[PDB]
Amino acid sequence: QKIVVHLRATGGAPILKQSKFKVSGSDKFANVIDFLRRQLHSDSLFVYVNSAFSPNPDESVIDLYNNFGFDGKLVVNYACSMAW
Amino acid sequence: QKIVVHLRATGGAPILKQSKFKVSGSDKFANVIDFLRRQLHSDSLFVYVNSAFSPNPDESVIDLYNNFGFDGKLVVNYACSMAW
């Protein structure tokens, strides 16, 4: 099984011309980390994936904004199914 | 203080014409949850925010994709210095 992997630059990191790849699902994530390390010429890159979670209803909006907001706003997603 | 909240529909949920709102930071997140459940007629809507984590080198691409993949792909964010 081949998985489509899209590399997304954040925090002002260099944008790669070739950001879309197809890789074997059995491949270890070390391969992705190593590819980026080589493309950007750095051994200390931040390589991460987003993870969804349902915020505590009792938490204030300002706190969630301070811990998860970006570019002046807090993005709140909503869905029927988490598997699209 | 007012916080801009960007509501985004995913996973089959109905899209709102105006999904951008100003909410008092002092309000509990419960107000956002209740707004969505009320306006979209569903008690079981997933209301989530995105967090982030760096996968371990030995993790397989397939598992990362099955666990956190989005719209037919695994999005890998990278930065030389982090900013949400």
Side-chain angles (χ1 to χ4, degrees), chain A residues 2-17 19-21 23-36 38-84, chain B residues 2-19 21-37 39-69 72-84:
Chain A
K2 234 63 165 54
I3 305 300
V4 179
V5 175
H6 285 195
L7 303 175
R8 183 167 182 277
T10 66
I15 297 173
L16 297 176
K17 174 179 176 176
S19 297
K20 305 178 181 186
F21 301 72
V23 63
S24 305
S26 61
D27 275 22
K28 293 300 185 296
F29 197 64
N31 291 176
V32 180
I33 296 176
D34 189 59
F35 177 77
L36 288 170
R38 297 193 254 89
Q39 294 301 291
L40 301 177
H41 298 290
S42 172
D43 285 306
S44 300
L45 290 176
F46 292 94
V47 181
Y48 59 99
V49 173
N50 294 119
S51 178
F53 77 94
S54 295
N56 182 0
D58 200 62
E59 186 161 351
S60 72
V61 174
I62 182 61
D63 284 350
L64 292 168
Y65 168 68
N66 289 325
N67 294 317
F68 304 97
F70 178 70
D71 194 7
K73 58 183 171 72
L74 170 67
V75 176
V76 174
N77 312 281
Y78 63 87
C80 294
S81 171
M82 292 302 295
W84 243 214
Chain B
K2 295 289 178 170
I3 306 301
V4 177
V5 175
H6 180 174
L7 297 176
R8 223 176 62 79
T10 73
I15 306 172
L16 291 168
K17 173 184 170 184
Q18 162 65 325
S19 265
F21 305 72
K22 279 207 173 187
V23 176
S24 292
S26 51
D27 280 27
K28 299 289 192 172
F29 190 63
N31 300 304
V32 180
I33 293 173
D34 306 346
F35 173 78
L36 288 170
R37 318 271 245 223
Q39 303 297 161
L40 300 184
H41 323 86
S42 178
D43 294 351
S44 60
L45 219 59
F46 283 87
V47 184
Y48 63 95
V49 166
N50 279 311
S51 180
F53 76 90
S54 290
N56 293 312
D58 82 308
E59 286 188 75
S60 74
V61 168
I62 184 63
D63 290 339
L64 284 174
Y65 174 65
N66 290 326
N67 302 335
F68 315 106
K73 62 203 191 304
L74 175 69
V75 181
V76 180
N77 305 286
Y78 66 86
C80 301
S81 181
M82 274 207 64
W84 224 236

mmCIF file with all atom_site columns, all heavy atoms in Angstrom, chain A residues 19-46, unseen atoms left out:
data_model
loop_
_atom_site.group_PDB
_atom_site.id
_atom_site.type_symbol
_atom_site.label_atom_id
_atom_site.label_alt_id
_atom_site.label_comp_id
_atom_site.label_asym_id
_atom_site.label_entity_id
_atom_site.label_seq_id
_atom_site.pdbx_PDB_ins_code
_atom_site.Cartn_x
_atom_site.Cartn_y
_atom_site.Cartn_z
_atom_site.occupancy
_atom_site.B_iso_or_equiv
_atom_site.pdbx_formal_charge
_atom_site.auth_seq_id
_atom_site.auth_comp_id
_atom_site.auth_asym_id
_atom_site.auth_atom_id
_atom_site.pdbx_PDB_model_num
ATOM 1   N N   . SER A 1 19 ? 6.789  18.787 -2.887 1.00 0.00 ? 19 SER A N   1
ATOM 2   C CA  . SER A 1 19 ? 6.242  18.568 -1.551 1.00 0.00 ? 19 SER A CA  1
ATOM 3   C C   . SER A 1 19 ? 5.276  17.394 -1.450 1.00 0.00 ? 19 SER A C   1
ATOM 4   O O   . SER A 1 19 ? 4.801  17.080 -0.360 1.00 0.00 ? 19 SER A O   1
ATOM 5   C CB  . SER A 1 19 ? 5.530  19.837 -1.061 1.00 0.00 ? 19 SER A CB  1
ATOM 6   O OG  . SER A 1 19 ? 6.432  20.927 -0.928 1.00 0.00 ? 19 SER A OG  1
ATOM 7   N N   . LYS A 1 20 ? 4.984  16.752 -2.575 1.00 0.00 ? 20 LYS A N   1
ATOM 8   C CA  . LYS A 1 20 ? 4.056  15.622 -2.586 1.00 0.00 ? 20 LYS A CA  1
ATOM 9   C C   . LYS A 1 20 ? 4.738  14.319 -2.982 1.00 0.00 ? 20 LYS A C   1
ATOM 10  O O   . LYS A 1 20 ? 5.385  14.230 -4.024 1.00 0.00 ? 20 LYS A O   1
ATOM 11  C CB  . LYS A 1 20 ? 2.896  15.911 -3.539 1.00 0.00 ? 20 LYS A CB  1
ATOM 12  C CG  . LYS A 1 20 ? 2.181  17.215 -3.235 1.00 0.00 ? 20 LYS A CG  1
ATOM 13  C CD  . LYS A 1 20 ? 1.060  17.500 -4.225 1.00 0.00 ? 20 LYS A CD  1
ATOM 14  C CE  . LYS A 1 20 ? 0.374  18.825 -3.909 1.00 0.00 ? 20 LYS A CE  1
ATOM 15  N NZ  . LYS A 1 20 ? -0.822 19.062 -4.760 1.00 0.00 ? 20 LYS A NZ  1
ATOM 16  N N   . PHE A 1 21 ? 4.597  13.305 -2.135 1.00 0.00 ? 21 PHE A N   1
ATOM 17  C CA  . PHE A 1 21 ? 5.204  12.008 -2.401 1.00 0.00 ? 21 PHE A CA  1
ATOM 18  C C   . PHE A 1 21 ? 4.260  10.855 -2.115 1.00 0.00 ? 21 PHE A C   1
ATOM 19  O O   . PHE A 1 21 ? 3.221  11.019 -1.478 1.00 0.00 ? 21 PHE A O   1
ATOM 20  C CB  . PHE A 1 21 ? 6.464  11.814 -1.547 1.00 0.00 ? 21 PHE A CB  1
ATOM 21  C CG  . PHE A 1 21 ? 7.518  12.854 -1.774 1.00 0.00 ? 21 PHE A CG  1
ATOM 22  C CD1 . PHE A 1 21 ? 7.344  14.157 -1.311 1.00 0.00 ? 21 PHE A CD1 1
ATOM 23  C CD2 . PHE A 1 21 ? 8.676  12.539 -2.474 1.00 0.00 ? 21 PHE A CD2 1
ATOM 24  C CE1 . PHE A 1 21 ? 8.309  15.133 -1.547 1.00 0.00 ? 21 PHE A CE1 1
ATOM 25  C CE2 . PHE A 1 21 ? 9.648  13.505 -2.717 1.00 0.00 ? 21 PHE A CE2 1
ATOM 26  C CZ  . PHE A 1 21 ? 9.461  14.809 -2.251 1.00 0.00 ? 21 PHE A CZ  1
ATOM 27  N N   . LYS A 1 22 ? 4.647  9.685  -2.607 1.00 0.00 ? 22 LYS A N   1
ATOM 28  C CA  . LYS A 1 22 ? 3.904  8.453  -2.401 1.00 0.00 ? 22 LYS A CA  1
ATOM 29  C C   . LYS A 1 22 ? 4.951  7.531  -1.804 1.00 0.00 ? 22 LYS A C   1
ATOM 30  O O   . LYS A 1 22 ? 6.041  7.391  -2.359 1.00 0.00 ? 22 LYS A O   1
ATOM 31  C CB  . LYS A 1 22 ? 3.394  7.901  -3.733 1.00 0.00 ? 22 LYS A CB  1
ATOM 32  N N   . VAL A 1 23 ? 4.645  6.931  -0.661 1.00 0.00 ? 23 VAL A N   1
ATOM 33  C CA  . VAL A 1 23 ? 5.602  6.041  -0.024 1.00 0.00 ? 23 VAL A CA  1
ATOM 34  C C   . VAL A 1 23 ? 4.909  4.805  0.529  1.00 0.00 ? 23 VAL A C   1
ATOM 35  O O   . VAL A 1 23 ? 3.716  4.832  0.834  1.00 0.00 ? 23 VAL A O   1
ATOM 36  C CB  . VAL A 1 23 ? 6.357  6.770  1.110  1.00 0.00 ? 23 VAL A CB  1
ATOM 37  C CG1 . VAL A 1 23 ? 5.390  7.191  2.190  1.00 0.00 ? 23 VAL A CG1 1
ATOM 38  C CG2 . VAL A 1 23 ? 7.437  5.878  1.679  1.00 0.00 ? 23 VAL A CG2 1
ATOM 39  N N   . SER A 1 24 ? 5.664  3.719  0.643  1.00 0.00 ? 24 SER A N   1
ATOM 40  C CA  . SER A 1 24 ? 5.129  2.468  1.154  1.00 0.00 ? 24 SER A CA  1
ATOM 41  C C   . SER A 1 24 ? 4.688  2.642  2.597  1.00 0.00 ? 24 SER A C   1
ATOM 42  O O   . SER A 1 24 ? 5.421  3.208  3.411  1.00 0.00 ? 24 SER A O   1
ATOM 43  C CB  . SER A 1 24 ? 6.195  1.380  1.074  1.00 0.00 ? 24 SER A CB  1
ATOM 44  O OG  . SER A 1 24 ? 6.697  1.256  -0.245 1.00 0.00 ? 24 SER A OG  1
ATOM 45  N N   . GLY A 1 25 ? 3.492  2.154  2.909  1.00 0.00 ? 25 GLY A N   1
ATOM 46  C CA  . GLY A 1 25 ? 2.980  2.260  4.263  1.00 0.00 ? 25 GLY A CA  1
ATOM 47  C C   . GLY A 1 25 ? 3.892  1.603  5.286  1.00 0.00 ? 25 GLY A C   1
ATOM 48  O O   . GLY A 1 25 ? 3.959  2.038  6.435  1.00 0.00 ? 25 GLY A O   1
ATOM 49  N N   . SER A 1 26 ? 4.608  0.562  4.866  1.00 0.00 ? 26 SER A N   1
ATOM 50  C CA  . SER A 1 26 ? 5.512  -0.158 5.757  1.00 0.00 ? 26 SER A CA  1
ATOM 51  C C   . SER A 1 26 ? 6.791  0.617  6.085  1.00 0.00 ? 26 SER A C   1
ATOM 52  O O   . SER A 1 26 ? 7.520  0.260  7.011  1.00 0.00 ? 26 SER A O   1
ATOM 53  C CB  . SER A 1 26 ? 5.871  -1.515 5.143  1.00 0.00 ? 26 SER A CB  1
ATOM 54  O OG  . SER A 1 26 ? 6.529  -1.354 3.900  1.00 0.00 ? 26 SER A OG  1
ATOM 55  N N   . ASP A 1 27 ? 7.068  1.672  5.322  1.00 0.00 ? 27 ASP A N   1
ATOM 56  C CA  . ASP A 1 27 ? 8.256  2.486  5.560  1.00 0.00 ? 27 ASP A CA  1
ATOM 57  C C   . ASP A 1 27 ? 8.211  3.126  6.945  1.00 0.00 ? 27 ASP A C   1
ATOM 58  O O   . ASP A 1 27 ? 7.148  3.525  7.421  1.00 0.00 ? 27 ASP A O   1
ATOM 59  C CB  . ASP A 1 27 ? 8.371  3.585  4.499  1.00 0.00 ? 27 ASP A CB  1
ATOM 60  C CG  . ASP A 1 27 ? 9.067  3.109  3.235  1.00 0.00 ? 27 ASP A CG  1
ATOM 61  O OD1 . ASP A 1 27 ? 9.083  1.886  2.985  1.00 0.00 ? 27 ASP A OD1 1
ATOM 62  O OD2 . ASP A 1 27 ? 9.593  3.959  2.485  1.00 0.00 ? 27 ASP A OD2 1
ATOM 63  N N   . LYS A 1 28 ? 9.371  3.212  7.588  1.00 0.00 ? 28 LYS A N   1
ATOM 64  C CA  . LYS A 1 28 ? 9.465  3.822  8.909  1.00 0.00 ? 28 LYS A CA  1
ATOM 65  C C   . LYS A 1 28 ? 9.508  5.340  8.740  1.00 0.00 ? 28 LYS A C   1
ATOM 66  O O   . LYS A 1 28 ? 10.109 5.853  7.790  1.00 0.00 ? 28 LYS A O   1
ATOM 67  C CB  . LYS A 1 28 ? 10.718 3.328  9.633  1.00 0.00 ? 28 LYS A CB  1
ATOM 68  C CG  . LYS A 1 28 ? 10.672 1.846  9.998  1.00 0.00 ? 28 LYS A CG  1
ATOM 69  C CD  . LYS A 1 28 ? 9.494  1.534  10.910 1.00 0.00 ? 28 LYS A CD  1
ATOM 70  C CE  . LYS A 1 28 ? 9.515  0.086  11.386 1.00 0.00 ? 28 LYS A CE  1
ATOM 71  N NZ  . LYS A 1 28 ? 9.354  -0.888 10.275 1.00 0.00 ? 28 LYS A NZ  1
ATOM 72  N N   . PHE A 1 29 ? 8.871  6.055  9.660  1.00 0.00 ? 29 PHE A N   1
ATOM 73  C CA  . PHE A 1 29 ? 8.822  7.509  9.582  1.00 0.00 ? 29 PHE A CA  1
ATOM 74  C C   . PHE A 1 29 ? 10.220 8.112  9.543  1.00 0.00 ? 29 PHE A C   1
ATOM 75  O O   . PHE A 1 29 ? 10.395 9.270  9.163  1.00 0.00 ? 29 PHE A O   1
ATOM 76  C CB  . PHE A 1 29 ? 8.032  8.080  10.761 1.00 0.00 ? 29 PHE A CB  1
ATOM 77  C CG  . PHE A 1 29 ? 7.594  9.500  10.559 1.00 0.00 ? 29 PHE A CG  1
ATOM 78  C CD1 . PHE A 1 29 ? 6.695  9.823  9.547  1.00 0.00 ? 29 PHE A CD1 1
ATOM 79  C CD2 . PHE A 1 29 ? 8.092  10.518 11.366 1.00 0.00 ? 29 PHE A CD2 1
ATOM 80  C CE1 . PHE A 1 29 ? 6.295  11.146 9.339  1.00 0.00 ? 29 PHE A CE1 1
ATOM 81  C CE2 . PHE A 1 29 ? 7.704  11.839 11.169 1.00 0.00 ? 29 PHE A CE2 1
ATOM 82  C CZ  . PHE A 1 29 ? 6.802  12.155 10.150 1.00 0.00 ? 29 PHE A CZ  1
ATOM 83  N N   . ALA A 1 30 ? 11.215 7.319  9.931  1.00 0.00 ? 30 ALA A N   1
ATOM 84  C CA  . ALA A 1 30 ? 12.597 7.777  9.918  1.00 0.00 ? 30 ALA A CA  1
ATOM 85  C C   . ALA A 1 30 ? 12.967 8.225  8.505  1.00 0.00 ? 30 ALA A C   1
ATOM 86  O O   . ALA A 1 30 ? 13.786 9.126  8.322  1.00 0.00 ? 30 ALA A O   1
ATOM 87  C CB  . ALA A 1 30 ? 13.523 6.652  10.370 1.00 0.00 ? 30 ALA A CB  1
ATOM 88  N N   . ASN A 1 31 ? 12.353 7.595  7.508  1.00 0.00 ? 31 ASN A N   1
ATOM 89  C CA  . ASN A 1 31 ? 12.627 7.926  6.115  1.00 0.00 ? 31 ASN A CA  1
ATOM 90  C C   . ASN A 1 31 ? 12.197 9.341  5.778  1.00 0.00 ? 31 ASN A C   1
ATOM 91  O O   . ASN A 1 31 ? 12.893 10.056 5.053  1.00 0.00 ? 31 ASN A O   1
ATOM 92  C CB  . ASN A 1 31 ? 11.919 6.936  5.193  1.00 0.00 ? 31 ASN A CB  1
ATOM 93  C CG  . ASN A 1 31 ? 12.514 5.545  5.272  1.00 0.00 ? 31 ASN A CG  1
ATOM 94  O OD1 . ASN A 1 31 ? 12.012 4.610  4.649  1.00 0.00 ? 31 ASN A OD1 1
ATOM 95  N ND2 . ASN A 1 31 ? 13.590 5.401  6.041  1.00 0.00 ? 31 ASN A ND2 1
ATOM 96  N N   . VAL A 1 32 ? 11.045 9.741  6.302  1.00 0.00 ? 32 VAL A N   1
ATOM 97  C CA  . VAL A 1 32 ? 10.527 11.079 6.058  1.00 0.00 ? 32 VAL A CA  1
ATOM 98  C C   . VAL A 1 32 ? 11.395 12.109 6.771  1.00 0.00 ? 32 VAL A C   1
ATOM 99  O O   . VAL A 1 32 ? 11.745 13.144 6.203  1.00 0.00 ? 32 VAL A O   1
ATOM 100 C CB  . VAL A 1 32 ? 9.075  11.210 6.554  1.00 0.00 ? 32 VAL A CB  1
ATOM 101 C CG1 . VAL A 1 32 ? 8.566  12.614 6.296  1.00 0.00 ? 32 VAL A CG1 1
ATOM 102 C CG2 . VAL A 1 32 ? 8.192  10.193 5.842  1.00 0.00 ? 32 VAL A CG2 1
ATOM 103 N N   . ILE A 1 33 ? 11.741 11.814 8.020  1.00 0.00 ? 33 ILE A N   1
ATOM 104 C CA  . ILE A 1 33 ? 12.580 12.702 8.812  1.00 0.00 ? 33 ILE A CA  1
ATOM 105 C C   . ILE A 1 33 ? 13.915 12.910 8.101  1.00 0.00 ? 33 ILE A C   1
ATOM 106 O O   . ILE A 1 33 ? 14.400 14.039 7.982  1.00 0.00 ? 33 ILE A O   1
ATOM 107 C CB  . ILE A 1 33 ? 12.857 12.104 10.212 1.00 0.00 ? 33 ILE A CB  1
ATOM 108 C CG1 . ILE A 1 33 ? 11.548 11.977 11.000 1.00 0.00 ? 33 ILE A CG1 1
ATOM 109 C CG2 . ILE A 1 33 ? 13.860 12.972 10.961 1.00 0.00 ? 33 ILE A CG2 1
ATOM 110 C CD1 . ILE A 1 33 ? 11.728 11.311 12.363 1.00 0.00 ? 33 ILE A CD1 1
ATOM 111 N N   . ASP A 1 34 ? 14.500 11.811 7.628  1.00 0.00 ? 34 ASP A N   1
ATOM 112 C CA  . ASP A 1 34 ? 15.789 11.863 6.948  1.00 0.00 ? 34 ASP A CA  1
ATOM 113 C C   . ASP A 1 34 ? 15.734 12.621 5.623  1.00 0.00 ? 34 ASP A C   1
ATOM 114 O O   . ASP A 1 34 ? 16.683 13.315 5.263  1.00 0.00 ? 34 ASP A O   1
ATOM 115 C CB  . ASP A 1 34 ? 16.323 10.455 6.710  1.00 0.00 ? 34 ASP A CB  1
ATOM 116 C CG  . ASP A 1 34 ? 17.750 10.461 6.217  1.00 0.00 ? 34 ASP A CG  1
ATOM 117 O OD1 . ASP A 1 34 ? 18.624 10.991 6.941  1.00 0.00 ? 34 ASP A OD1 1
ATOM 118 O OD2 . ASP A 1 34 ? 17.998 9.946  5.108  1.00 0.00 ? 34 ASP A OD2 1
ATOM 119 N N   . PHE A 1 35 ? 14.628 12.490 4.898  1.00 0.00 ? 35 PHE A N   1
ATOM 120 C CA  . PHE A 1 35 ? 14.478 13.198 3.629  1.00 0.00 ? 35 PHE A CA  1
ATOM 121 C C   . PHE A 1 35 ? 14.495 14.707 3.872  1.00 0.00 ? 35 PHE A C   1
ATOM 122 O O   . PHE A 1 35 ? 15.198 15.446 3.183  1.00 0.00 ? 35 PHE A O   1
ATOM 123 C CB  . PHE A 1 35 ? 13.163 12.812 2.944  1.00 0.00 ? 35 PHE A CB  1
ATOM 124 C CG  . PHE A 1 35 ? 12.902 13.567 1.668  1.00 0.00 ? 35 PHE A CG  1
ATOM 125 C CD1 . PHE A 1 35 ? 13.562 13.223 0.492  1.00 0.00 ? 35 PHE A CD1 1
ATOM 126 C CD2 . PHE A 1 35 ? 12.019 14.640 1.650  1.00 0.00 ? 35 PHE A CD2 1
ATOM 127 C CE1 . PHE A 1 35 ? 13.342 13.941 -0.686 1.00 0.00 ? 35 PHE A CE1 1
ATOM 128 C CE2 . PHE A 1 35 ? 11.794 15.364 0.482  1.00 0.00 ? 35 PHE A CE2 1
ATOM 129 C CZ  . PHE A 1 35 ? 12.457 15.014 -0.689 1.00 0.00 ? 35 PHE A CZ  1
ATOM 130 N N   . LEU A 1 36 ? 13.720 15.163 4.856  1.00 0.00 ? 36 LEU A N   1
ATOM 131 C CA  . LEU A 1 36 ? 13.654 16.587 5.177  1.00 0.00 ? 36 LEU A CA  1
ATOM 132 C C   . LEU A 1 36 ? 14.982 17.108 5.695  1.00 0.00 ? 36 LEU A C   1
ATOM 133 O O   . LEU A 1 36 ? 15.396 18.215 5.355  1.00 0.00 ? 36 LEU A O   1
ATOM 134 C CB  . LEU A 1 36 ? 12.567 16.851 6.220  1.00 0.00 ? 36 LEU A CB  1
ATOM 135 C CG  . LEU A 1 36 ? 11.140 16.718 5.689  1.00 0.00 ? 36 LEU A CG  1
ATOM 136 C CD1 . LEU A 1 36 ? 10.163 16.748 6.859  1.00 0.00 ? 36 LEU A CD1 1
ATOM 137 C CD2 . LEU A 1 36 ? 10.854 17.849 4.708  1.00 0.00 ? 36 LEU A CD2 1
ATOM 138 N N   . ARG A 1 37 ? 15.637 16.312 6.531  1.00 0.00 ? 37 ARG A N   1
ATOM 139 C CA  . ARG A 1 37 ? 16.929 16.707 7.083  1.00 0.00 ? 37 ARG A CA  1
ATOM 140 C C   . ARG A 1 37 ? 17.912 16.964 5.944  1.00 0.00 ? 37 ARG A C   1
ATOM 141 O O   . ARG A 1 37 ? 18.716 17.892 6.007  1.00 0.00 ? 37 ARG A O   1
ATOM 142 C CB  . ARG A 1 37 ? 17.468 15.611 8.011  1.00 0.00 ? 37 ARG A CB  1
ATOM 143 N N   . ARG A 1 38 ? 17.835 16.143 4.900  1.00 0.00 ? 38 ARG A N   1
ATOM 144 C CA  . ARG A 1 38 ? 18.722 16.284 3.747  1.00 0.00 ? 38 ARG A CA  1
ATOM 145 C C   . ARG A 1 38 ? 18.345 17.468 2.862  1.00 0.00 ? 38 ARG A C   1
ATOM 146 O O   . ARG A 1 38 ? 19.214 18.195 2.381  1.00 0.00 ? 38 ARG A O   1
ATOM 147 C CB  . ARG A 1 38 ? 18.715 15.005 2.900  1.00 0.00 ? 38 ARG A CB  1
ATOM 148 C CG  . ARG A 1 38 ? 19.249 13.780 3.623  1.00 0.00 ? 38 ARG A CG  1
ATOM 149 C CD  . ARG A 1 38 ? 19.531 12.622 2.664  1.00 0.00 ? 38 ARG A CD  1
ATOM 150 N NE  . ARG A 1 38 ? 18.544 11.547 2.751  1.00 0.00 ? 38 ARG A NE  1
ATOM 151 C CZ  . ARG A 1 38 ? 17.423 11.480 2.038  1.00 0.00 ? 38 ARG A CZ  1
ATOM 152 N NH1 . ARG A 1 38 ? 17.124 12.431 1.163  1.00 0.00 ? 38 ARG A NH1 1
ATOM 153 N NH2 . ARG A 1 38 ? 16.597 10.456 2.202  1.00 0.00 ? 38 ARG A NH2 1
ATOM 154 N N   . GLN A 1 39 ? 17.050 17.660 2.646  1.00 0.00 ? 39 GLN A N   1
ATOM 155 C CA  . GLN A 1 39 ? 16.581 18.752 1.804  1.00 0.00 ? 39 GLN A CA  1
ATOM 156 C C   . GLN A 1 39 ? 16.836 20.122 2.407  1.00 0.00 ? 39 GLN A C   1
ATOM 157 O O   . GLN A 1 39 ? 17.139 21.078 1.687  1.00 0.00 ? 39 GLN A O   1
ATOM 158 C CB  . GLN A 1 39 ? 15.083 18.604 1.524  1.00 0.00 ? 39 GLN A CB  1
ATOM 159 C CG  . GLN A 1 39 ? 14.743 17.399 0.683  1.00 0.00 ? 39 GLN A CG  1
ATOM 160 C CD  . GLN A 1 39 ? 15.429 17.429 -0.665 1.00 0.00 ? 39 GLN A CD  1
ATOM 161 O OE1 . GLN A 1 39 ? 15.105 18.251 -1.521 1.00 0.00 ? 39 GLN A OE1 1
ATOM 162 N NE2 . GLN A 1 39 ? 16.390 16.537 -0.859 1.00 0.00 ? 39 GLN A NE2 1
ATOM 163 N N   . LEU A 1 40 ? 16.701 20.218 3.727  1.00 0.00 ? 40 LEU A N   1
ATOM 164 C CA  . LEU A 1 40 ? 16.898 21.485 4.415  1.00 0.00 ? 40 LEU A CA  1
ATOM 165 C C   . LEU A 1 40 ? 18.287 21.642 5.026  1.00 0.00 ? 40 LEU A C   1
ATOM 166 O O   . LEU A 1 40 ? 18.611 22.704 5.542  1.00 0.00 ? 40 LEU A O   1
ATOM 167 C CB  . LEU A 1 40 ? 15.838 21.657 5.504  1.00 0.00 ? 40 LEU A CB  1
ATOM 168 C CG  . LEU A 1 40 ? 14.384 21.626 5.032  1.00 0.00 ? 40 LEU A CG  1
ATOM 169 C CD1 . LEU A 1 40 ? 13.470 21.734 6.241  1.00 0.00 ? 40 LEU A CD1 1
ATOM 170 C CD2 . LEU A 1 40 ? 14.123 22.770 4.056  1.00 0.00 ? 40 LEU A CD2 1
ATOM 171 N N   . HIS A 1 41 ? 19.099 20.589 4.968  1.00 0.00 ? 41 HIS A N   1
ATOM 172 C CA  . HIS A 1 41 ? 20.454 20.635 5.511  1.00 0.00 ? 41 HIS A CA  1
ATOM 173 C C   . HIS A 1 41 ? 20.495 20.953 7.009  1.00 0.00 ? 41 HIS A C   1
ATOM 174 O O   . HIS A 1 41 ? 21.249 21.819 7.461  1.00 0.00 ? 41 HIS A O   1
ATOM 175 C CB  . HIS A 1 41 ? 21.276 21.660 4.726  1.00 0.00 ? 41 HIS A CB  1
ATOM 176 C CG  . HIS A 1 41 ? 21.422 21.330 3.272  1.00 0.00 ? 41 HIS A CG  1
ATOM 177 N ND1 . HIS A 1 41 ? 22.191 20.278 2.821  1.00 0.00 ? 41 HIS A ND1 1
ATOM 178 C CD2 . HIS A 1 41 ? 20.894 21.910 2.167  1.00 0.00 ? 41 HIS A CD2 1
ATOM 179 C CE1 . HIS A 1 41 ? 22.134 20.226 1.501  1.00 0.00 ? 41 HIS A CE1 1
ATOM 180 N NE2 . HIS A 1 41 ? 21.353 21.205 1.080  1.00 0.00 ? 41 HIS A NE2 1
ATOM 181 N N   . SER A 1 42 ? 19.681 20.235 7.777  1.00 0.00 ? 42 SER A N   1
ATOM 182 C CA  . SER A 1 42 ? 19.626 20.425 9.222  1.00 0.00 ? 42 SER A CA  1
ATOM 183 C C   . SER A 1 42 ? 19.392 19.109 9.955  1.00 0.00 ? 42 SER A C   1
ATOM 184 O O   . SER A 1 42 ? 18.636 18.258 9.490  1.00 0.00 ? 42 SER A O   1
ATOM 185 C CB  . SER A 1 42 ? 18.513 21.410 9.591  1.00 0.00 ? 42 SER A CB  1
ATOM 186 O OG  . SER A 1 42 ? 18.328 21.462 11.000 1.00 0.00 ? 42 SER A OG  1
ATOM 187 N N   . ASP A 1 43 ? 20.037 18.954 11.108 1.00 0.00 ? 43 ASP A N   1
ATOM 188 C CA  . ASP A 1 43 ? 19.880 17.749 11.912 1.00 0.00 ? 43 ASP A CA  1
ATOM 189 C C   . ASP A 1 43 ? 18.924 17.971 13.076 1.00 0.00 ? 43 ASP A C   1
ATOM 190 O O   . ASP A 1 43 ? 18.703 17.063 13.879 1.00 0.00 ? 43 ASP A O   1
ATOM 191 C CB  . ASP A 1 43 ? 21.231 17.291 12.470 1.00 0.00 ? 43 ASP A CB  1
ATOM 192 C CG  . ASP A 1 43 ? 22.099 16.637 11.421 1.00 0.00 ? 43 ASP A CG  1
ATOM 193 O OD1 . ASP A 1 43 ? 21.619 15.683 10.775 1.00 0.00 ? 43 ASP A OD1 1
ATOM 194 O OD2 . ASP A 1 43 ? 23.258 17.068 11.246 1.00 0.00 ? 43 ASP A OD2 1
ATOM 195 N N   . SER A 1 44 ? 18.354 19.170 13.169 1.00 0.00 ? 44 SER A N   1
ATOM 196 C CA  . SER A 1 44 ? 17.456 19.489 14.271 1.00 0.00 ? 44 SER A CA  1
ATOM 197 C C   . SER A 1 44 ? 16.128 20.106 13.846 1.00 0.00 ? 44 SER A C   1
ATOM 198 O O   . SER A 1 44 ? 15.666 21.092 14.428 1.00 0.00 ? 44 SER A O   1
ATOM 199 C CB  . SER A 1 44 ? 18.170 20.417 15.253 1.00 0.00 ? 44 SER A CB  1
ATOM 200 O OG  . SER A 1 44 ? 19.336 19.797 15.772 1.00 0.00 ? 44 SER A OG  1
ATOM 201 N N   . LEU A 1 45 ? 15.507 19.509 12.840 1.00 0.00 ? 45 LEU A N   1
ATOM 202 C CA  . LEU A 1 45 ? 14.227 19.992 12.342 1.00 0.00 ? 45 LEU A CA  1
ATOM 203 C C   . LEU A 1 45 ? 13.059 19.503 13.185 1.00 0.00 ? 45 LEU A C   1
ATOM 204 O O   . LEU A 1 45 ? 13.134 18.457 13.826 1.00 0.00 ? 45 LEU A O   1
ATOM 205 C CB  . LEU A 1 45 ? 13.990 19.498 10.918 1.00 0.00 ? 45 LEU A CB  1
ATOM 206 C CG  . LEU A 1 45 ? 14.807 20.046 9.756  1.00 0.00 ? 45 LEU A CG  1
ATOM 207 C CD1 . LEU A 1 45 ? 14.413 19.290 8.489  1.00 0.00 ? 45 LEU A CD1 1
ATOM 208 C CD2 . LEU A 1 45 ? 14.542 21.536 9.604  1.00 0.00 ? 45 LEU A CD2 1
ATOM 209 N N   . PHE A 1 46 ? 11.975 20.272 13.166 1.00 0.00 ? 46 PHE A N   1
ATOM 210 C CA  . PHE A 1 46 ? 10.752 19.887 13.856 1.00 0.00 ? 46 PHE A CA  1
ATOM 211 C C   . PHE A 1 46 ? 9.913  19.270 12.746 1.00 0.00 ? 46 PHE A C   1
ATOM 212 O O   . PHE A 1 46 ? 9.642  19.923 11.733 1.00 0.00 ? 46 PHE A O   1
ATOM 213 C CB  . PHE A 1 46 ? 10.013 21.104 14.418 1.00 0.00 ? 46 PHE A CB  1
ATOM 214 C CG  . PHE A 1 46 ? 10.726 21.777 15.538 1.00 0.00 ? 46 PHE A CG  1
ATOM 215 C CD1 . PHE A 1 46 ? 11.572 22.852 15.302 1.00 0.00 ? 46 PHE A CD1 1
ATOM 216 C CD2 . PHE A 1 46 ? 10.566 21.320 16.843 1.00 0.00 ? 46 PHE A CD2 1
ATOM 217 C CE1 . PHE A 1 46 ? 12.253 23.470 16.350 1.00 0.00 ? 46 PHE A CE1 1
ATOM 218 C CE2 . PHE A 1 46 ? 11.241 21.929 17.899 1.00 0.00 ? 46 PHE A CE2 1
ATOM 219 C CZ  . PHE A 1 46 ? 12.086 23.005 17.653 1.00 0.00 ? 46 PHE A CZ  1
#
